[PDB]
Amino acid sequence: AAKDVKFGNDARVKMLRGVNVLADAVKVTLGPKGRNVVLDKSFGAPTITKDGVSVAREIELEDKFENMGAQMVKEVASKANDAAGDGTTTATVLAQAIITEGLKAVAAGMNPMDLKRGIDKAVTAAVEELKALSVPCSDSKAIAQVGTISANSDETVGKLIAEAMDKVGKEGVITVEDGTGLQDELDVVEGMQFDRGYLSPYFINKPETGAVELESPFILLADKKISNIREMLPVLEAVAKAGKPLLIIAEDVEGEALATLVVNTMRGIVKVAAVKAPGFGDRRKAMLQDIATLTGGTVISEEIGMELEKATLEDLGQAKRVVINKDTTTIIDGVGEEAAIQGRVAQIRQQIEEATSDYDREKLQERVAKLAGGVAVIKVGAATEVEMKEKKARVEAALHATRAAVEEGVVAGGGVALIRVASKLADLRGQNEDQNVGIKVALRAMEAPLRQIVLNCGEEPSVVANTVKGGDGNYGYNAATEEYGNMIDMGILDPTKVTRSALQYAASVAGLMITTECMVTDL
Amino acid sequence: AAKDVKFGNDARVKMLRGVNVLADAVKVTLGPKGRNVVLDKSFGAPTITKDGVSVAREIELEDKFENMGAQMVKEVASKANDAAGDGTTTATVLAQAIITEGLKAVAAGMNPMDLKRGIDKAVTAAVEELKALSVPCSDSKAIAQVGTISANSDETVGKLIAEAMDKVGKEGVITVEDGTGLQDELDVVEGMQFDRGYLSPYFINKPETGAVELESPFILLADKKISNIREMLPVLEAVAKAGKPLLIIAEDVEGEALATLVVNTMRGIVKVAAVKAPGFGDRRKAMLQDIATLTGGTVISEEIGMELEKATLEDLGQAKRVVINKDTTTIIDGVGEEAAIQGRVAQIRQQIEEATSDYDREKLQERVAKLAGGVAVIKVGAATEVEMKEKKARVEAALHATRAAVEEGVVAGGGVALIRVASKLADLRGQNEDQNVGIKVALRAMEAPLRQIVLNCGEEPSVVANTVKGGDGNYGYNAATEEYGNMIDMGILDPTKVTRSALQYAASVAGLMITTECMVTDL
Amino acid sequence: AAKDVKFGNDARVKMLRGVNVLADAVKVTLGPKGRNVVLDKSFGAPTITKDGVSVAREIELEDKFENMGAQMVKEVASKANDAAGDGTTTATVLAQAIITEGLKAVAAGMNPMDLKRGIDKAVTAAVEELKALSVPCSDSKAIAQVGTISANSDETVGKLIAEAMDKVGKEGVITVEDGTGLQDELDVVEGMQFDRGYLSPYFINKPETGAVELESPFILLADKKISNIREMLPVLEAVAKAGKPLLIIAEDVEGEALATLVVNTMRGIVKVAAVKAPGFGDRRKAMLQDIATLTGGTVISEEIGMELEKATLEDLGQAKRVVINKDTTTIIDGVGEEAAIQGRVAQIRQQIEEATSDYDREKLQERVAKLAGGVAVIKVGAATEVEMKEKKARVEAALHATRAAVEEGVVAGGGVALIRVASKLADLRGQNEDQNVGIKVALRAMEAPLRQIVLNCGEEPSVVANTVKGGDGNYGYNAATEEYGNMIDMGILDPTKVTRSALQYAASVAGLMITTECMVTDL
Numbered sequence A, B, C: 001a002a003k004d005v006k007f008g009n010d011a012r013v014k015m016l017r018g019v020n021v022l023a024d025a026v027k028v029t030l031g032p033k034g035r036n037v038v039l040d041k042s043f044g045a046p047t048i049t050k051d052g053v054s055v056a057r058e059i060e061l062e063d064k065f066e067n068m069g070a071q072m073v074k075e076v077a078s079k080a081n082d083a084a085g086d087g088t089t090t091a092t093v094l095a096q097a098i099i100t101e102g103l104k105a106v107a108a109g110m111n112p113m114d115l116k117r118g119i120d121k122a123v124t125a126a127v128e129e130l131k132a133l134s135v136p137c138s139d140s141k142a143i144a145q146v147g148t149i150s151a152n153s154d155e156t157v158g159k160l161i162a163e164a165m166d167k168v169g170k171e172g173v174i175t176v177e178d179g180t181g182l183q184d185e186l187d188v189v190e191g192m193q194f195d196r197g198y199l200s201p202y203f204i205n206k207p208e209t210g211a212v213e214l215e216s217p218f219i220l221l222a223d224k225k226i227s228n229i230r231e232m233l234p235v236l237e238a239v240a241k242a243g244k245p246l247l248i249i250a251e252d253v254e255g256e257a258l259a260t261l262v263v264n265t266m267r268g269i270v271k272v273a274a275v276k277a278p279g280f281g282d283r284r285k286a287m288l289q290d291i292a293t294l295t296g297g298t299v300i301s302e303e304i305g306m307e308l309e310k311a312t313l314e315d316l317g318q319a320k321r322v323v324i325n326k327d328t329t330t331i332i333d334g335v336g337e338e339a340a341i342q343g344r345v346a347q348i349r350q351q352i353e354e355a356t357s358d359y360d361r362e363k364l365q366e367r368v369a370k371l372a373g374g375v376a377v378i379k380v381g382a383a384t385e386v387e388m389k390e391k392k393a394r395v396e397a398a399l400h401a402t403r404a405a406v407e408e409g410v411v412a413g414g415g416v417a418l419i420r421v422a423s424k425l426a427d428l429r430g431q432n433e434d435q436n437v438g439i440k441v442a443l444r445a446m447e448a449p450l451r452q453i454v455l456n457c458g459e460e461p462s463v464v465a466n467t468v469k470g471g472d473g474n475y476g477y478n479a480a481t482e483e484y485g486n487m488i489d490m491g492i493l494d495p496t497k498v499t500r501s502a503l504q505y506a507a508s509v510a511g512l513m514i515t516t517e518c519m520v521t522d523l
């Protein structure tokens, strides 16, 4: 309907207020100092989680303007959250500080554009500093510590992550499942994971994550694309006798012919999934073969002249479960044959050696690696189901952060990096004063999140911040210790990527918020 | 729609108030001192039951926040209630005490996390103490006493439970049915019970319990899974002539093929149930045979080459009634053949002796035991139908508690164990003061429920509690006696499991409530 | 329903107020001095763009009268915006100034008709002056500057435009696509663009622009019109096996026979597009051949006697993507054959030389040119997706302005031309005093937008305007420099066309607004 539009400060104020409200809840929560949080639901019994984001997610502002402003922060934060895996709160915190200052500057009447530019400039500088500052991720002990941070003093999670990580290998993917029982179980599962997307979000399964899990999926592998129903049909007929959920692997499915018939014609009542076959060219075929062996199913190719129609259910392999995400599709455990799987690996392994070329070797080695590596599953036990879910969520978050952290390497946590960089940043000047102030603002913003932790401590963040700044090198405040020590030595490190990601997003949000002169809402 | 969100104390207060309201009603009811209770219904004539839970169930809070808070307690309590079979109220009572104190601490501004940790720590310690404290369940006389407790001075129920228990055997399952007449009837029913789930909750019958009872069920046993309709169909055709409700036993039914056709295609107007055949492997087959003999029906196997289609109704056995619960499925009474059943038992019995191996013996013995044991049914008479229903419900509750109690063993009732443990607990210290207070709080919480009983007595719980604490060993207050005596000697014992369960859940709830900074509701 | 009607000043005032509100937001935004702008949305997260228009678009007036008045300005402005590519704001600014003065005159009670006439007369004179004033567009360096203006100090955009422009050629069309990644990519794409409309807006694709883009379009070329389904059908059948989206090229499709069947009979679920074949006569055929070669598809003609029905999918070519706009339809990249395409070009090229006649040469040369030129695609990277979209939009706007600007040639920006012309204009007199005032008003209107920029600067526009007027030749104020210098030398030039377009439209609007005695609204 009609929209109410506000311009200038009035628009800004609404945004600011909204931002603060969201930020405030988030800020307190963030930091190990902050207590976890439970979220009430009108819908049903309250949801128990430990995420800054969740608080934000819950929080809605009645005021449209405020709400919208709040929303803006959240969306950006989530984006940072996804990439970083962590630091959702941090970005929010950073954004709020930046925005407020920026708004004040707007109040100043300085031209916000320069400020944004200055902020951006500052951010870039900070990023560079951070990168230099950052150091490679430390060993598993560090990993556990990294895990613990995501843990928020969940020792078990960190341990689990480290343990899972060790067995699987850092590179190897780790999957989390609900625990069978209170005791956690870590079982390596045989199977291969290949990075393939899900063709359509429609395929995407019930769960919020949107990764699709199939129970006892059936795997059909075809090198060939599945053009039309007719070729499909005789597969289907066997499938009808089946009815265990179907997963399909094809080089590609041409959307219209297959999908049009499938969607419109076919109810698709039986669960189906489609993924592109991994790799391309011979390698793709090889990968398919590897998959096929692991599945224990067989692959049909035109070259073979095997017909999909002809192929029965038996040809299709089965998996204990399959999980698919947009980035990647994995099979937790193909039934496979133990001998068969091993034999294939050896054969591939032999091939790897055989090939003179690195390229050939790499492909072969990659192929073997996938099968050999398998996938790792982690079960989280809990005293209660609710706890388990909560624990599981935390575990998952930790895992992603840990994985990201390791690759990125770790930087001192506590926003130490942020504060440290800022000091260097301060010297840098923007082109013009307006830019200069913005740059300063950004610096100020960085400082704030350190303070917030301190505030949670109840120690006066001013002293801490001042002290932190004074210390050269990696100097920081450990909340738990409440003692000054090297962050690295302490072993509490925040991932570089996460820190970087959050800062950039927050800056972006802040800049956007500052710029946005006007807001419009519905009446 | 839009949600109203509250944070901090404000959120807490709403929860607290809600908790109190629910708790208060429950607390008074709990304890033999408390009077039973009737629940009004707008729907229709009031419902008469004797459960603390029911009061809670009825109670809804108009305030969303309060209501939600209330809900949280209830849900946890119910969970405890299910496992313990009893102590629903106790958990609620415990939770309330813990929550209030925890909230106060929150008011204190101590970091609730430590408190929760302390509480958890305290709980763990208490649990250990309780376990040591607990003693094995006493004999039937004790059992009756246990029954009486569930009875809340329902002598008959305890007697019935004991009587039923004796005949059936404690291990043997006892089932309760509405009494034919005022006089209770205890009839042992021939039949076997095997622990199998119901495939789908959809199958789950009308009654609230969700156990499904079939009247004159027909039993089809197939070793083989029922893949598809077609094989099924000729069974069905016979069934059409039939129309007595069908129960199906199959090793498994593959969901999609059978279910998809069945659900979509088949109205399923005739009652149908499916259960997995008990056991696996040969034993499963053997079990099926045992079942088949008991049913008097025949089993069809691929190995036999008998066809389901071929099999007629006659092949299917009939049961007088079948009850299915998720944990287990039982047949109250297969028509069976008296001779046939006996013969099979003997044959199995011979087999048991025959097998050298323990394993073989165990399976065989288990098989015979099921048939031999049969199931026991208890009828509850009542002056009026309404009374009977009420009585029946009480009886059922008592039975579960008794069964749980016996296995667990009995500990002094009256919350004596709780108070006793607490004293020991007090010495234990948490890591930090905040934890310490939480630990103390938990201890305090334990004490409270003893007081509540005393309050019902009208005696000043302080003195009683003090006295109780002072006494070493099992020292407690018997409400009925209003005299001090050994709980064990008194023979009023609360099950260890129930006590433990309630405490843990309550603690969990309390901890959660404390933690939950914020609540959100719809507007 | 019933309408509320206002006449005379009352109607005018509502319009005026509405105009001002819209204008005010726009005016501030306009000019590099003005900050960009973000637009709030009730619908979802706010939209980030940099357009004066967008602000106007957002702005709606609650008052019907005001809103309607506001709408009038916007619609005209947009029209100017489309043609000019730029100067949307300028027109709005101009209109507002004119309207207010005109209204005042209406208040004066002078007969507005004369005023309108005077305004029109003034406009015409101004236009002539502008045209003389205008100079040809300068070289790429200028182009970049032109780009930067559209950029609003987006250096990259200007660079991209210049870079894209250089490679493609100014004449050559440049297309913008979202960047694959943060880094922009400029790839020339092989393909030909021919100016053909889309038969129906229905065809028009999802995007707001209404240009239709097909992914991997299939191209069917027929010289012949597609009369009816039947001939079509065998094409369709092949297509059914297909299902990649179809694009159709035909000399014409007779609407009723094809469309009636197609629309009604055919769901048209598969994407389809139709375009008229470029050119007419032999040239058209030749063009088709060129297209066909580029596509790699084949064309079917009656003369050939090839049947559409007979023709398979293979005959149809494929394009990586096709974009269609009403003015023109382009194929970004036909798969084509590299050799084939080249060969055809050579063949055509030979033909061009071969033909004695200029006419023949021109057609041939044009034909070759299209293939040879190909299309250029620009990718815009962004830190974030949102940014990219915003950047992309800006880029697109810049491109259109640049293209227009170059052809038109550049005139001094800053409204320098407008002010300059006005002085000359002032001498000119209208037929009658009422006309005279209107003429003056128009002159005044022209001056205003210069002032607005100055106002953004915060410099007093009076002095600047006076100074600007005083300077002969191209004299203007550079906001960025805040120094006086030649506009041309500065290199900040606004396109003649855009300036002219905006002025004319604004004048038209203003005249209309003045004339409109009465407004009617719904109640």
Ligand SMILES: Nc1ncnc2c1ncn2[C@@H]1O[C@H](COP(=O)(O)OP(=O)(O)OP(=O)(O)O)[C@@H](O)[C@H]1O
Pocket (backbone or CB within 6 Å): A029, A030, A031, A032, A050, A051, A052, A053, A081, A086, A087, A088, A089, A090, A091, A149, A150, A412, A413, A414, A415, A453, A477, A478, A479, A480, A481, A492, A493, A494
């Ligand atoms: N003992 C500690 N001393 C100093 N800072 C710590 C300590 N443990 C963790 N932190 C810091 O607390 C922050 C991590 O907490 P949290 O994960 O809540 O923040 P976040 O990642 O921004 O929020 P969210 O995880 O909800 O997105 C990091 O800056 C981390 O270094």
Ligand SMILES: Nc1ncnc2c1ncn2[C@@H]1O[C@H](COP(=O)(O)OP(=O)(O)OP(=O)(O)O)[C@@H](O)[C@H]1O
Pocket (backbone or CB within 6 Å): B029, B030, B031, B032, B050, B051, B052, B053, B081, B086, B087, B088, B089, B090, B091, B149, B150, B412, B413, B414, B415, B453, B477, B478, B479, B480, B481, B492, B493, B494
């Ligand atoms: N004569 C008695 N003296 C002392 N305490 C008693 C006596 N009889 C029963 N109790 C105690 O009263 C409590 C049992 O009552 P009740 O079953 O109402 O509590 P509850 O199990 O927590 O509530 P609900 O059964 O509604 O879940 C136990 O702690 C039990 O030991």
Ligand SMILES: Nc1ncnc2c1ncn2[C@@H]1O[C@H](COP(=O)(O)OP(=O)(O)OP(=O)(O)O)[C@@H](O)[C@H]1O
Pocket (backbone or CB within 6 Å): C029, C030, C031, C032, C050, C051, C052, C053, C081, C086, C087, C088, C089, C090, C091, C149, C150, C412, C413, C414, C415, C453, C477, C478, C479, C480, C481, C492, C493, C494
């Ligand atoms: N440094 C400068 N000095 C003087 N005027 C400038 C300078 N850079 C740009 N301008 C002027 O600002 C105006 C262009 O800004 P803008 O594109 O916002 O106006 P617009 O085209 O009317 O609005 P829109 O683009 O929203 O339709 C032109 O008159 C242009 O010459």
Ligand SMILES: [Mg+2]
Pocket (backbone or CB within 6 Å): A086, A087, A088, A089, A150
């Ligand atoms: Mg985090």
Ligand SMILES: [Mg+2]
Pocket (backbone or CB within 6 Å): B086, B087, B088, B089, B150
């Ligand atoms: Mg009880």
Ligand SMILES: [Mg+2]
Pocket (backbone or CB within 6 Å): C086, C087, C088, C089, C150
């Ligand atoms: Mg413009």
